[PDB]
Amino acid sequence: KNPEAEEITRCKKLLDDSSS
Amino acid sequence: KNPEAEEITRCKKLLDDSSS
Amino acid sequence: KNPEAEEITRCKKLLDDSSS
Numbered sequence: 551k552n553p554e555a556e557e558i559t560r561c562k563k564l565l566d567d568s569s570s
Numbered sequence: 571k572n573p574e575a576e577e578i579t580r581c582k583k584l585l586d587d588s589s590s
Numbered sequence: 591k592n593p594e595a596e597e598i599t600r601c602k603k604l605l606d607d608s609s610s
């Protein structure tokens with residue numbers, strides 16, 4: 551439940567945006 | 571053997587902490 | 591096609607460098 555979890559979510563978006 | 575390897579280790583911890 | 595894609599490329603290099 552740590553706030554750092556937000557960073558992980560961003561990573562996922564970054565990977566998807568890789569095609570962008 | 572580069573010191574940057576430490577960053578990779580942190581990434582792993584971040585992924586696990588994702589459930590936190 | 592976003593410039594952020596460069597960050598993703600770096601991540602890949604970091605993972606490989608993990609053995610370094």
Ligand SMILES: *Cc1cc(C*)cc(C*)c1
Nearest residue numbers: 558561577578581598601
């Ligand atoms: C979340 C994350 C972590 C690492 C080590 C690298 C990338 C691209 C994303």
